[PDB]
Design a protein around this ligand. Sequence first.
Ligand SMILES: *[C@@H]1O[C@H](CO)[C@@H](O)[C@H](O)[C@H]1NC(C)=O
Lengths: 50, 49
Amino acid sequence: DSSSGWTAGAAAYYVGYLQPRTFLLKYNENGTITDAVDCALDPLSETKCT
Amino acid sequence: LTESNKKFLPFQQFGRDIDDTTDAVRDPQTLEILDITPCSFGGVSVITP
Ligand SMILES: *[C@@H]1O[C@H](CO)[C@@H](O)[C@H](O)[C@H]1NC(C)=O
């Protein structure tokens, strides 16, 4: 009936949640964002952003 | 205002530089780049014997 038989088919979707962090961003000659670093993961990144 | 050679992305428009002022704009009608840089500064000098 309207509630039992149906075909789903293969798909899979990923869901995440965000968090207020600080980022360091690398823009290029086109101004397009080309790279980033999360300087709250490791000391070496902290050095980078400072 | 001066005509530009800059190439914005289709949604981009500010003139934010190292100091983040304005040296770029897009005509809301012709959608072309107009660099902004004022006509002034300041320095003074009188020479006398
Ligand atoms: C954008 O990048 C390309 C790389 O193929 C380069 O040829 C072009 O000069 C760049 N545009 C700007 C805005 O300088």
